Amino acid sequence: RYSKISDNYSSLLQVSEALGRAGLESSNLIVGIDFTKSNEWTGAKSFNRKSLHHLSNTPNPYEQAITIIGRTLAAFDEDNLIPCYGFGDASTHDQDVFSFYPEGRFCNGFEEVLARYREIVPQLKLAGPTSFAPIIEMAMTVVEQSSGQYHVLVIIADGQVTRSVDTEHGRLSPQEQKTVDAIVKASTLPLSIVLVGVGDGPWDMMQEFDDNIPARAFDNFQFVNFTEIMSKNKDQSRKETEFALSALMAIPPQYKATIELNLLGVRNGNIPQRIPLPPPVQ
């Protein structure tokens, strides 16, 4: 379906226009970046055995993903203020996020997101394990503090949530329990969640993930495999639009649901205030 819609789009501007015709209006963007040690090995097949956070004169998968999403959503962003967070490094493990800037100051535009990313990356100690509960809970706090403005949280990651050793007997890890609880609670807020997968994966358990989440107020989650789409036999510009559409197509019906449920523009009243740690840098 995504390939069929994207086949006629050679410009990201065309994707933006399609999102608008589907009903998207003013939208803020929140970015969360996976800084786990796993990034050092998950480019074994897809990134010539370099770390996925490797910096050079050409953008790595994190930079590429941020650029495409940033460009596509920019026209909907009425303040251009993008709060950005890291998680999975030694300062946060699976418990916290850190803000890109001290005191949690927001980035001004996706270009500053990219620039600040490049500044921070070499100074980080990569760690683990992998949970998305802290980043989703941080996004919840931002949405609530904004008085219910619509936000899209984009998480870019190179692995699934850490599993239990006894997963074969149906057991969940604490990372899974807390991440899934967070996705459920998030649907009390006007928030869309997009998980962008970069690198080798594996990702095979993500095609069923959203369908297995417990009862929610609305379907608020979408997975997209960046690396798989960008590896297809398709010209570069149309691969980029296929990625943008696959990532964001679910967003306008989610937005309309926040309006139907009357979540837009109001406060929930039951959102813990998560405090992001400072960037562990110069």
Domain boundaries, the chain: 2-159+206-220+233-260
The residues pairing with 33 across neighbouring beta strands, listed in sequence order, are: 86, 156
* Residue-wise burial string across 150-170, b where 16 or more C-beta atoms lie within 10 A, e elsewhere: bbbbbbbbbbbbbbeeeeeee
232 Cβ neighbours under 8 A, 6+ residues apart: 239, 242
Asked if 24 and 190 count as a contact pair (C-beta separation under 8 A), the reply is no
Q: Which of 279, 280, 272, 281 is nearest to 134 (CA)?
A: 272
Cite the DSSP H helix spans in 22-108.
61-73
Dist. CA 81–CA 255, nearest whole Å:
19
Dist. CA 262–CA 113, nearest whole Å:
31
Asked if 161 and 173 count as a contact pair (C-beta separation under 8 A), the reply is yes
Q: Which of 151, 125, 148 is nearest to 136 (CA)?
A: 151
Q: Scan for tokens 């840098």, then name that residue.
A: 281
| Burial of 140: CB neighbours in 10 Å, binned 0-12, 13-18, 19+ | buried
What is the three-class DSSP state of 29? Answer: strand
CATH fold of 2-159+206-220+233-260, please?
Rossmann fold (3.40.50)
Q: Which amino acid is at 184?
A: V
Dist. CA 102–CA 276, nearest whole Å:
9
What is the three-class DSSP state of 222? Answer: strand
Q: Which two tokens stand for residue 12?
A: 């990201």
Dist. CA 10–CA 230, nearest whole Å:
14
Peptide bond into 253 cis (omega under 30): no
Dist. CA 240–CA 210, nearest whole Å:
24
Q: Measure CA of the first residue to CA of the last residue in the chain; give whole Å.
A: 46
Dist. CA 171–CA 12, nearest whole Å:
42
Q: Which of 112, 106, 99 is nearest to 70 (CA)?
A: 112
Q: Which two tokens stand for residue 53?
A: 């956070």
30 Cβ neighbours under 8 A, 6+ residues apart: 82, 83, 84, 85, 138, 139, 142, 151, 152, 153, 154
Asked if 90 and 280 count as a contact pair (C-beta separation under 8 A), the reply is yes
Ordered DSSP codes for 231-253: TSSS-HHHHHHHHHHHHHTTHHH
Task: Characterize the bridge pairing of strands 28-34 and 151-157.
Answer: parallel
Q: What's the full length of the chain, in residues?
A: 282
Task: Characterize the bridge pairing of strands 98-99 and 151-157.
Answer: unpaired
42 Cβ neighbours under 8 A, 6+ residues apart: 52, 158, 159, 198, 199, 200, 201
Give me the resolution in angstroms, 1 decimal.
1.5
Asked if 124 and 89 count as a contact pair (C-beta separation under 8 A), the reply is yes
Cite the DSSP H helix spans in the chain.
2-6, 12-21, 61-73, 110-120, 133-145, 174-186, 226-230, 236-248, 251-260
What is the three-class DSSP state of 138? Answer: helix
Dist. CA 108–CA 131, nearest whole Å:
27
Dist. CA 67–CA 64, nearest whole Å:
5
Q: Scan for tokens 């996004």, then name that residue.
A: 139
Q: Which two tokens stand for residue 251?
A: 């967003």
Q: Which two tokens stand for residue 15?
A: 């994707």
Q: Which amino acid is at 192?
A: S
Asked if 117 and 33 count as a contact pair (C-beta separation under 8 A), the reply is yes
Dist. CA 61–CA 66, nearest whole Å:
9
The residues pairing with 107 across neighbouring beta strands, listed in sequence order, are: 82
